[PDB]
C-alpha cells in the first residue's frame, strides 16, 4: 500500500493515483472539489468554498467538464477534437487537479498553476495536452490546474444587479488560488512561490489577476502565452454585456410574454432553463460576423476590474514581479477558417483581392471604412497587391497582430518600464504531428504540447529532436518558476535569454536551433495598432 | 567668318561662334531673340513673336537672364552659386540658344530642347552645367535651350483679367517650341523629331506641355527629370494665386490705397514698380513656413490647363508617345537646409525627435495634425525612434517622396497604363566634385552635369570612370531622342533597359556599375501618399 497517495487537506481526506512516465512515477490527485456545485439558484453567482466532507473523496480520475459549446466545424479532425471536452458536461464542474513528484518533496517546492484557454467559452483542465505528469517528473515541481465556468455560466453579466454580477469565472480561478495557498503544503508545495501560467483566454486571465488587488496576493510570478488582458476580445463594456445577456434571455423565452424585464426576473427565468438551451444560443448574441470574438467575456465592472485593463496597466506599479510573455509564429491562421471568406483547411486558401478586403472587415470588426482602409494600406504588398499567397499571409498577420501580438507587446513594454522584469519569446517550431494544413504554420495554441512534455509520451510519434526540445522548454518554464529567471543559474555555456525592455525590446526564438536573440516584437506593425489606430478612431 | 557660322532664319540673319571640345568643334548660336522684350506695358502679358530684323544679329554670347531672386544662403559656396545667374539680370531675356554639330548635318537630325528648373522662380539657360557643346559633339544632335520668365514676371496670375492671365512663362516656352518648328531646319534639325527634356520645374513644365493641346503638336517625346506636373508644388488654385498677387501688390504699395481696387488698377500699379522691387518681396507672400514651396507657379486657369494636372493625367490618351522619367537617390536632402530646424550643410545634421516632428510640419505644409501623425508613423523606425541619423534620412525621404518620387511614380503609372511607353531610372552616383556634405547623398539636381557631358571638360577634376559614365548617359538620352528607346538599337552585350509598366514597375539604377533592373519606385511609401493620405484629408 502506497502511503503517499492519501493526503488530508482542510476539507477532508483524498485518495490519489500513481501515474507512470518513461522516467519515473508521479503522484496525482485529480478531481478535488474546491467549491460548492454552482447549480440551481447558485447559477451565475460567485462560488462558495467547498464545505468539509466525511470519509475519503476519490481523486483518481478527472471530474466533469463545465458546460460549453462543442466545436463541430470539422468532425473527427484531430486539430479540433483535441480541444473538445473529454469528460461529461455538467454545471457541477468546479474541481481542480494536483500533480506532485514521487517521492513527495521533503522541502517546499515551487508551484505552477495552469489556467486553460478557449475564448472564455470552452476549455477544460483534463485535456490530454494539459497532462502535467511529464513536467512534474522531469523538473520535480508541483503543478495545479482548475476548472472555471465558461460561457454564460461564467461570464454572463447584468451589471449592477447581484443575481448576475459577472466575472464569476474569474472568481472560480481566484477561489482555486486561495485553495492552493491553504492546501498545497500538504502536497509538498511552497505557497510562497506560486507561478501562474496560461494560454489564450488563460493568459488574459493571468493578466486580469495581475490587475486585481485581491488576486494579487495569491501568486508571485506570471506567464502569459499568446494572450493579454488588454486584447480587444478579452473584455467587454457594461452596456454591451447587458445587451448580450438580454439578447440571450430573449432567444430562450425570457421573460415570458407580458412579464416585466427587470434584472431579478430575467435571471430568475434564465436559472430555470436547461444548461444546453443556453449553450445553443451562445453565438447568436454576437453583433457582427467576426473571428476572434466571443459572446461572454470578462466585463469591466469596477469590482474585479476597477477600470479597463489598458488603464490599469498604464497606472500600475509592478516592481518585484517577473513575467514571461510570448507568442507563436502564426497567431491568426487558426481563426481564419472560422468565418473569413475563401479560407478552408482542406485547400491552400489562395484568397483573392476581394476576399482579402472582406476578411479585413471580419478580422477587424467595428471599425470605420477609413480605419479599415489604413489596415489594407499597412498589410498590402503594393509590389504584388494581387498575389493570393501574400494576401493569405497578410490576413493572418492582421488577425494575429490585432488580437495577440500587439496587445502582448503593449503589455510587455509597460510592465518592463514600470518595475517588472519580463522575458519575451516567439515560438517558431511547427510540430511534426500537426494535423493542420501547412500554410497555417505554427498556429495559435500549438506550443502547449512541448511545454507540458507531451512529446515524451511513448505512444506518440514525435521525433527525438522534439523530445529534447520539449525538455529545454520544460527547463525554461521551471527555472522561471524557481528563480524568476529562465536562464540556468549554474550555466554560462548555454546562450543567454536577455530580459525584455521598452528600449532594446529583445526576445528569443524557440525552435530546434539554439536560442537566438532578436529585437522588435513586430514594432512597425504594432505601432499602427497601438499608436495610430486609436487616434484614427477618435477623429472618426 | 566661316560658312557654317552664318545662318538665315525667318526673322533675319545670325552669326554664330565655333566652340571647342576635346573631341571636335561645334557650332553654337547663343542669344537668338524669339520674342519681343516683355517690358513696360508688356509685363505680365503673353509673349509676342519677334519681329523681323535688319542686318546680322550677333549670336556669339549668351543674353541676359530673366529677373529672379539670387540665392544668398551660402555666399561663395559652389553648391549654391552654380545655380545663380551668370549674366546681367534684365526683363529683356526671351532668348534661345542652338548648338549644332560641325560640319552641319546634311540630313535631318533629331532635336533636344532643354527647359531648366529652379522652382519657377529662378534658373537660366546660360548656366555652365547646361552647356550643350559636349552632348552635341559626342552624339551629333541638335540641342536647343530657351529662357522663360520666372517668378512674378512669369507666373503672377490675377485669374479672369486680361492684364495678368498667368502662366506666361509657360507661353514663353511654347513660343520657343513654335520657333523650333519654324527654324530648326536651318541648323540641320528635324522638326518631326523633337524631344523635350527638363529637370525639377523644367520637368514639371515638360509635363504640362504634355497636358496642353496647343503644345502637344510641337514635340514628340518627353523626358521628366526629378519633377512632374502633378507635384504638390507645381500648381496653385485660382483663389490662392489671386491672394498671392494681391499680397505682393500690397507689399510694394499697390494700389495707393484706398485708390482701388480691381485687377486693371492693380496690374497698372505693378507695372510701374522697378523689377527688383517685386523680387525683394517674392518670398513674403507664401502662406506658411515650408520647404519645396514657391510663390508664383503655374495656375490652373482653364486655358493652358483645362483642369488640374491630376485630372488631365487620369483622363488622357497617351498612345504613340514615349517618356523617360526618373529621380535621384536623395531628392529631399537639398531642401532641408532651407528651413528645417536643426539642419545645416556645415555639420552632420543629427537632428533630435523634437526637430524631426517640427520638420514634418515644414516639409508637409498645410495638413491636419492627424495627417502629420500618419506621416510620422510611416517614416519612423519604431525600434530606433530617436536615432538622429535615421531621423535625418527619414525627413529627407519625407520631402523627397511628397514632392518628387511619388508624384513621378503616379504619373509614370498612369502614363504606361494609358498608351505611352515609359522608361524609369534612379540616379545613384555621387559626383566626386560634389561640394555638398556627405549626408546629403545624391542631391536633387546633380545628375544634370552627367547628362550634358560636363565631366568631359578637361578643366574640371572628374575621374576617368565618371567620364565614361557621362558618355554612357549621353548615349541613353540620345538613343531615346532618335528612336524612342534608350537601349542601343543593335548592341546585345549591354544590359537591356526594360520599359516601365503599371504592374511590374521595372526601372534601372544609373551609376558606375552596369545597368541593374529593380522593381518599385518606393511602392510602399508612395501608396501612403498617392492613395491613403488623400482619403485622410477628405475626412478631416
Ligand atoms: O452551421 N453553423 C455552425 C456554427 C455555429 C456557430 N458558430 C459560432 N462559432 C464561431 C467561432 C468559433 C470558433 N472560434 O475560435 C466557434 C463557433 C460557428 C459555426
Ligand atoms: C528669403 N528666402 C526664403 C526661402 C528661400 C528658399 N529658397 O529655395 C529662399 C529665400
Ligand atoms: C483563446 C482565445 O482562448 C483561443 C484558445 C483556442 N484553443 C484551441 C487554443 C483552446
Ligand atoms: C526644382 C523645383 O526646380 C528645383 C531646382 C533647383 N536647382 C538647384 C536644381 C535648380
PDB file of N, CA, C and O and ligand atoms in Angstrom, chain B residues 69 71 121 283 294 335 338, ligand 2:
ATOM      1  N   UNK B  69      15.148  85.996 -58.103  1.00  0.00           N
ATOM      2  CA  UNK B  69      15.802  86.012 -56.803  1.00  0.00           C
ATOM      3  C   UNK B  69      17.176  85.358 -56.902  1.00  0.00           C
ATOM      4  O   UNK B  69      17.363  84.369 -57.616  1.00  0.00           O
ATOM      5  N   UNK B  71      20.133  83.502 -54.823  1.00  0.00           N
ATOM      6  CA  UNK B  71      20.357  82.763 -53.587  1.00  0.00           C
ATOM      7  C   UNK B  71      21.556  83.340 -52.845  1.00  0.00           C
ATOM      8  O   UNK B  71      22.658  83.429 -53.398  1.00  0.00           O
ATOM      9  N   UNK B 121      11.005  80.096 -59.998  1.00  0.00           N
ATOM     10  CA  UNK B 121      11.419  81.405 -59.516  1.00  0.00           C
ATOM     11  C   UNK B 121      12.828  81.796 -59.937  1.00  0.00           C
ATOM     12  O   UNK B 121      13.213  82.954 -59.732  1.00  0.00           O
ATOM     13  N   UNK B 283       9.227  86.172 -51.663  1.00  0.00           N
ATOM     14  CA  UNK B 283       9.101  85.125 -50.657  1.00  0.00           C
ATOM     15  C   UNK B 283       8.198  85.512 -49.495  1.00  0.00           C
ATOM     16  O   UNK B 283       7.873  84.649 -48.673  1.00  0.00           O
ATOM     17  N   UNK B 294       6.943  77.382 -53.521  1.00  0.00           N
ATOM     18  CA  UNK B 294       7.339  78.578 -54.249  1.00  0.00           C
ATOM     19  C   UNK B 294       6.134  79.486 -54.449  1.00  0.00           C
ATOM     20  O   UNK B 294       4.991  79.024 -54.525  1.00  0.00           O
ATOM     21  N   UNK B 335      16.694  70.450 -49.965  1.00  0.00           N
ATOM     22  CA  UNK B 335      15.792  71.484 -49.474  1.00  0.00           C
ATOM     23  C   UNK B 335      15.742  71.572 -47.955  1.00  0.00           C
ATOM     24  O   UNK B 335      15.158  72.525 -47.429  1.00  0.00           O
ATOM     25  N   UNK B 338      17.160  74.644 -46.175  1.00  0.00           N
ATOM     26  CA  UNK B 338      16.449  75.845 -46.443  1.00  0.00           C
ATOM     27  C   UNK B 338      15.323  76.155 -45.485  1.00  0.00           C
ATOM     28  O   UNK B 338      14.449  76.903 -45.799  1.00  0.00           O
TER      29      UNK B 338
HETATM   30  C1  LIG C   2      14.174  84.532 -48.301  1.00  0.00           C
HETATM   31  N1  LIG C   2      14.138  83.146 -48.822  1.00  0.00           N
HETATM   32  C2  LIG C   2      13.316  82.186 -48.217  1.00  0.00           C
HETATM   33  C3  LIG C   2      13.288  80.886 -48.712  1.00  0.00           C
HETATM   34  C4  LIG C   2      14.074  80.536 -49.805  1.00  0.00           C
HETATM   35  C5  LIG C   2      14.040  79.235 -50.297  1.00  0.00           C
HETATM   36  N2  LIG C   2      14.645  79.059 -51.482  1.00  0.00           N
HETATM   37  O1  LIG C   2      14.629  77.700 -52.046  1.00  0.00           O
HETATM   38  C6  LIG C   2      14.891  81.485 -50.409  1.00  0.00           C
HETATM   39  C7  LIG C   2      14.927  82.787 -49.921  1.00  0.00           C
END
